[model samples]
Target: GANDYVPSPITINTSTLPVVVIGPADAHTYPRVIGELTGTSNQYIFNGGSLIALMRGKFTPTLPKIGKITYNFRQQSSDFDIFDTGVPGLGIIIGMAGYWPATPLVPINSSSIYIDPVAANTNPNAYNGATGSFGARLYVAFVATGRLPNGYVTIPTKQLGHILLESNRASLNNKRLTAPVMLNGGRAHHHHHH
Candidate 1:
């Protein structure tokens, strides 16, 4: 008589472990743009915010860094209702860095302080990161997130474009106008006699 063989420990082992999934950290998103510098090199710099200003006075290479400057450009053509300030946001004013509020302000210390030479830009709709140039050089500043050891949150900014028009001489009487001028108008307006 043959003995029937019995299978011992014929059972499944519960060896599945739990998983702990993780996520990515929060990023401090800020404006990142390539700007231009006047004088010696005639090169460009990194601009944190919009650097196009609608100047209403004579665009001299040695203009003041800051003051009661108008950030808007004039009516370029047949439409004052559609005022065009180069790129949206209060562009990076050369001297009004600290005066501007956070969220898209001027760069802290730009390489060159520049502005739209002619306030009345002709082709206001042709300047942007993909098109036009940064325009005349004055003074530009590139900024970043930082702490002054006094517990203060730093601000950020954006880029500039075309479609702005205004003159420094006219800014004395007007201030609400807008345009699409850039640190450079992109295409071309008035060039300095280097």
Candidate 2:
């Protein structure tokens, strides 16, 4: 006897893809927040409410694959200040439409930028004076190769995006708790629509 099996065709479409927005449990926490971006071609856009929502615990979204790509936020401190102005601009880390080094193809405005590692690694004072203050938003893209017994990914790679932090305030002590921060664009190519 002979048996025949037929498999359905796989369709790759943007609509079939899902969009996931993983944010921190609390945005008000010092330094910054940690979020995750998983799934196939998921896009995220951060706004004032998104910030407030993360801090308030109004939303808790999860990825389909369980443990996958992860994103983290680190505060940058220089002499004393803690601002997002170290990496230069967003374009340096992320690529816009028709931009070079175009990998993720994500669009992040000033508001979307958050505290990242660059701001934390460069600053010397840790968390003391104005010049020491440093922090910027980070966007990372990685894949989960294997799963562990504890439900965590085995390895993560494809690191991208590194920017500096900037602020008008001179000192961290006097800076507003929820100040309106901005992240500028630097030297980088844009993403072209195909």
Candidate 3:
């Protein structure tokens, strides 16, 4: 009778459901990951559609609220290429899009403006739940999906043991950090600093 009683949460929900870039090993269809956050707190985590991490950028949130602000992250594609953003909302929030497109198909050192639901100061409208952008101290992380090279091994099956090699960072407490060693190919470029 157990076989006949088998049930599942699997079902068609919304159409805006984002592209699942990666899933966790434990997830029925998501890649698990080993991640870290210096000054943020975990408010929510689901699939490729929602990876919300909060920081203290100090911007009042307008999302799910504010209408004055704007926020959206859109990148969509099936064509094989290494350019042009694709699959937004794989759900991302680009607050006040006219400002930050939030449309970054590649990695970057930093980008400002916010996320989370606060006072809806100045971001997007549609995504902010018929309110303001509902802003700040926020970020979104989604797997850059799509096929890979022939010999390139498939993404970490267990979402484990994956070293992204390169990296990026942003100050959370509004404090600038010194990573030591002046950057840029380790070259002084004649610019002197005491």
Candidate 4:
């Protein structure tokens, strides 16, 4: 019957909850540009911003029950999802179980999160010499069931700073035709007729 023994309950000693830290107002603070020299239908894309939760003090998690660490959020724009890790663009490269583009609930197994900026246009070949931008507004909640110094805790959510992205297009065309001399296999050709 030793194998049938149940696990002990988990408890924490702290009054403060985990703090949520987001990126600066300009998510594009640290920007990396992506473009093509030929300008033959290229998609310019980049990622910006960072997110994380700071635990104040000692905290114990209640696993195999309902005390798993997790996070919740809402995207400011319906055109894109902040939880998206990757997307299709000029050049390209999941920790959560749920219907995406459907819910805001996401598991927070990592220490931080990053924003994936997605514009209205998903097609890489749709660029036509125009500049555009995409951004996201995040509201996060560090959800967990634990006993703090204040007593039982449950809900805590806050809105982070804005995330902005920029994408511009540039193309150049300079034609020059010169050095015209009639020749045959490295030999000069005949003169003009009279």
User: Can you write out model 1's per-residue Cα lDDT over 33-96, one digit (the tens) per residue?
Assistant: 1122331111121111233322321122222222122222210111111111223211233321
For residues 8-27, write the lDDT of model 2, one tens digit per residue: 11111212112212224432
Candidate 2 deviant stretches above 4 angstroms: 1-137, 145-173, 176-194
Higher-scoring candidate on TM-score, 1 or 4: 4
Residue 130 in model 2: shift from native, Å?
12
Q: What does candidate 1 score on TM?
A: 0.18
Question: Ten residues in a row with the worst lDDT in model 2?
Answer: 52-61
* Candidate 4 clash figure, as a count: 0
Stretches of candidate 4 off by over 4 Å are: 1-133, 151-194
Q: What is the C-alpha RMSD of each candidate to the true structure, in Å?
A: 28.7, 22.3, 21.0, 31.4
Error of 2 at 67 (Å): 13
Candidates, ranked, lDDT: 1, 2, 3, 4
**Model number with the top lDDT:** 1
Better of 3 and 4 by TM-score: 4
lDDT by candidate, in order shown: 0.22, 0.21, 0.19, 0.19
Q: Candidate 3: how many backbone clashes?
A: 44
- Evaluated at residue 187, the lDDT of candidate 3 is 9
- Candidate 4's error at 176, in angstroms? 36
Q: Where does candidate 4 have its weakest 10-residue lDDT segment?
A: 175-184
Best by TM-score: 4
